[PDB]
Coordinates of C-alpha atoms in Angstrom, one line a residue:
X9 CA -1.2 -16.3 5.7
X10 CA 1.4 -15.1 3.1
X11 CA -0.6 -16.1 0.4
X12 CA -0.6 -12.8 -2.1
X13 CA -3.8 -11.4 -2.5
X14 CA -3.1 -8.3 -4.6
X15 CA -0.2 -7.1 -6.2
X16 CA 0.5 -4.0 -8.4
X17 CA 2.6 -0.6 -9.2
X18 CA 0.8 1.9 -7.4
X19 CA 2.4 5.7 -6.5
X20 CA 3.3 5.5 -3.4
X21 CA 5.2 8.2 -0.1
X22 CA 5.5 7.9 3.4
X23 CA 3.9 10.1 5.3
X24 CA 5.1 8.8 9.1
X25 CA 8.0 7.0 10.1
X26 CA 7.5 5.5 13.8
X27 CA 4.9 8.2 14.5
X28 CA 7.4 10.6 13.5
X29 CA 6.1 13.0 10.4
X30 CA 8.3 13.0 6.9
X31 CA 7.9 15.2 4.0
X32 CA 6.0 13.7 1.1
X33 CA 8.2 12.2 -1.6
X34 CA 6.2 10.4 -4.4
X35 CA 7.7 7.3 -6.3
X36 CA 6.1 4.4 -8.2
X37 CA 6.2 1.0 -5.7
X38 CA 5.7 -2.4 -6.7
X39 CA 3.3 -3.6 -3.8
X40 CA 2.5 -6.6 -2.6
X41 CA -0.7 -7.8 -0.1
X42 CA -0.6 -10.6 1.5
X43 CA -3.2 -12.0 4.5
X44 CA -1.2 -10.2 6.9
X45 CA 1.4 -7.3 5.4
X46 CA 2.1 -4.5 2.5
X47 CA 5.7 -5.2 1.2
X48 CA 6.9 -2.6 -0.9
X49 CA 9.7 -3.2 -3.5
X50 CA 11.2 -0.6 -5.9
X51 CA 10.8 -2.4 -9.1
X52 CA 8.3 -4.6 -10.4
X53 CA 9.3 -8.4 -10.9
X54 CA 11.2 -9.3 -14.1
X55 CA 8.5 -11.3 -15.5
X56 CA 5.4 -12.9 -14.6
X57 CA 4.4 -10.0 -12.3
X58 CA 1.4 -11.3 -11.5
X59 CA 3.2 -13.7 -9.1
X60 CA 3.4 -10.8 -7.0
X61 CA 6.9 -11.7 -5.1
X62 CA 8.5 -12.8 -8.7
X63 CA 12.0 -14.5 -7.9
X64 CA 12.2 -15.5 -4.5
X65 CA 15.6 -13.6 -4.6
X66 CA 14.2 -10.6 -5.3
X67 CA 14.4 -8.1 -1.9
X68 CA 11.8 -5.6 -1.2
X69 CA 12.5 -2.0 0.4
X70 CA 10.3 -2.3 3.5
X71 CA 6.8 -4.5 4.2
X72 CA 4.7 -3.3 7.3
X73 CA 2.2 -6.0 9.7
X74 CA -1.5 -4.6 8.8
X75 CA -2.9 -5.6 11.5
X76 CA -4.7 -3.3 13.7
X77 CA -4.0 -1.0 10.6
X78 CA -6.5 1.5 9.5
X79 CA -7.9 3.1 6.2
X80 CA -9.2 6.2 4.8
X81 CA -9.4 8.5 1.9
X82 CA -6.4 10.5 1.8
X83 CA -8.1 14.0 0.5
X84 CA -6.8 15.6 3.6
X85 CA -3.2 14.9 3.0
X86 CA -3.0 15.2 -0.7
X87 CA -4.4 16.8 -3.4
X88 CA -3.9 13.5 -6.4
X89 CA -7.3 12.4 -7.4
X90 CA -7.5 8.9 -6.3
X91 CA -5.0 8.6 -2.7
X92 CA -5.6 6.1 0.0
X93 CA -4.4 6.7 3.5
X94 CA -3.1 3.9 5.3
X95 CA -1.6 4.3 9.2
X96 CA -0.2 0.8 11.2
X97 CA 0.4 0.2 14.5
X98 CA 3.7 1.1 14.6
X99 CA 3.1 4.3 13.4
X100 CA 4.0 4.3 9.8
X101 CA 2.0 5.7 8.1
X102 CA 1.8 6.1 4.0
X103 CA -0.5 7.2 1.0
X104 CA -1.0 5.0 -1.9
X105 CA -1.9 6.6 -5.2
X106 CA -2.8 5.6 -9.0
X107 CA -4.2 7.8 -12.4
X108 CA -6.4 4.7 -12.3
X109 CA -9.6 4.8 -10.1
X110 CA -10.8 1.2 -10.8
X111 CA -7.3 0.0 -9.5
X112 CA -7.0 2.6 -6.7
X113 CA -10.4 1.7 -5.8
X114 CA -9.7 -2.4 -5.9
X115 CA -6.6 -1.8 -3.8
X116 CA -9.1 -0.2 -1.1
X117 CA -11.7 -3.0 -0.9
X118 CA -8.7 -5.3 -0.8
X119 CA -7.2 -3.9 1.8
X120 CA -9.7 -3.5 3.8
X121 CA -10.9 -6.8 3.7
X122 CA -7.1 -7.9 4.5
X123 CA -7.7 -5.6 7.4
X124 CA -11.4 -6.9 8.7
X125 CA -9.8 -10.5 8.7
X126 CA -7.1 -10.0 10.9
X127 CA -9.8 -8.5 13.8

């Protein structure tokens, strides 16, 4: 459903676009999880960011379908301490990234249970 079930600033680059492979380029993302997507928007919410989507007007930069999506450590693709690789069915594929292991670490067991669900 889009219920949110996470939402947070996390450092954030593609790494595929349509199986096609992009040079890294690193910026904060406002992200947003929902039962079935990552929507990615390049500023948190004005207020109340715990809302996740804050103002319904508010229009996010991309959002990808996770299912069939799969998750792994990212040590292989970047050298930042805590980096989670992520890879959809299209082929778009990104790493997520925070200074902050418990978050980082939250956002994995989030998204993978996102993930399992949709199975």
């Amino acid at each position: 459903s889009h219920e949110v079930e996470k939402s947070g600033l996390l450092n954030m680059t593609k790494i595929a676009q349509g199986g096609r492979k992009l040079r890294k380029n690193w910026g904060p993302s406002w992200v947003v999880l929902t039962g079935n997507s990552l929507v990615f928007y390049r500023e948190p919410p004005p207020t109340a960011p715990s809302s996740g989507w804050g103002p319904a007007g508010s229009r996010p930069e991309s959002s990808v379908d996770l299912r069939g999506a799969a998750l792994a450590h990212g040590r292989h693709l970047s050298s930042r301490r805590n980096v989670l690789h992520i890879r959809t069915i299209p082929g778009h594929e990104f790493l997520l990234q925070s200074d902050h292991e418990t978050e980082l670490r939250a956002w994995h067991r989030a998204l993978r249970t996102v993930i399992e669900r949709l199975v």
